[PDB]
Automatic annotation (TrEMBL), chain C:
The protein's name in its UniProt record: Envelope glycoprotein
Subcellular location: Virion membrane
Domain of life: Viruses
Range covered out of full length: 289 to 298 of 419
Amino acid sequence: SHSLRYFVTAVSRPGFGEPRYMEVGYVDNTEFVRFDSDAENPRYEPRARWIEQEGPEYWERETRRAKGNEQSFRVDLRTALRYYNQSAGGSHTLQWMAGCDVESDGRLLRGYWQFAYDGCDYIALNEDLKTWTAADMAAQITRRKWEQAGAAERDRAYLEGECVEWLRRYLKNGNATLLRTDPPKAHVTHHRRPEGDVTLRCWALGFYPADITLTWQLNGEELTQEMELVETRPARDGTFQKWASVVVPLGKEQKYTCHVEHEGLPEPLTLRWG
Amino acid sequence: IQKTPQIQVYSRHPPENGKPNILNCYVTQFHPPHIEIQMLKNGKKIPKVEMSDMSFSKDWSFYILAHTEFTPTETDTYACRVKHASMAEPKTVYWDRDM
Amino acid sequence: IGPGRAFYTI
């Protein structure tokens, strides 16, 4: 499965100018394009080499789409003040995420097209891609308007058409980058705590794709809530990073072992304090 | 609704004196999106700091990564100071060189 | 390519 998703944000700032507007596009867990109204040059920009192969028509077209969206969101921020009857001097946020998850074989799995206002669900297109779920009173007003206007129909056309077709194109043109495999490097580090015991930290870095399994075992038994497992996140070079730590008794670290599983490894990697 | 940012400061790989590394300040779970992140070295702002383009999660909370190249030293202190509407005063998180 | 708000405002 693969995905093409766009994360959009509009943040008003009364007294500081027009709302800040941003768009970030991702193929799976990798950003490849972005738009920021506050950038040195406010237009669509590549964020990965493989997308740079797209001609000028692509950048001017996406730039136009982004600026058109920006105007739409400016209007939406004003309307929202009215729906919620809020003061006109405060800052507010409108968020939107749309995209498609496609089956291992160019078959659409799920479509997304949802909004949030001031960090809370506002309205979202249901899985049938034909109906809307409004989270509150105000969103109910938007829903009625979109049903009468036929918004879903056009939105679905994007998800089932453009979103799917372009993702296929992106996966092909960016194959060397998007479908590559960078093996993880792993380490275990040893820090004595002030309380007298020891914190063992298992590192996993420089890997791609993001999916990875990192765990601590005690006497060959996987630990769960007893260890601290942070979520994996990106590094600056397009790879990912993760780590897990466990507090163990001073003198008993030979009993703890860290396990790493990743498609970039030929077999699970087991490490110990060293 | 507002959400206070969770701050994580860590190096790319185990720190070793005289060996280049990358220091990270990963700020997540915050709202509103307006935020200021400053990576500091010995109480002084680091000039060359790059940040990823801000995005958000399923729960709609934002996140961003700040990073800079550095060579671990035995005594230099690194920190990430964050200012956000959710906090009355800036929040500073020190990097644990012994991680 | 990205999604378009078209003219469907909230």
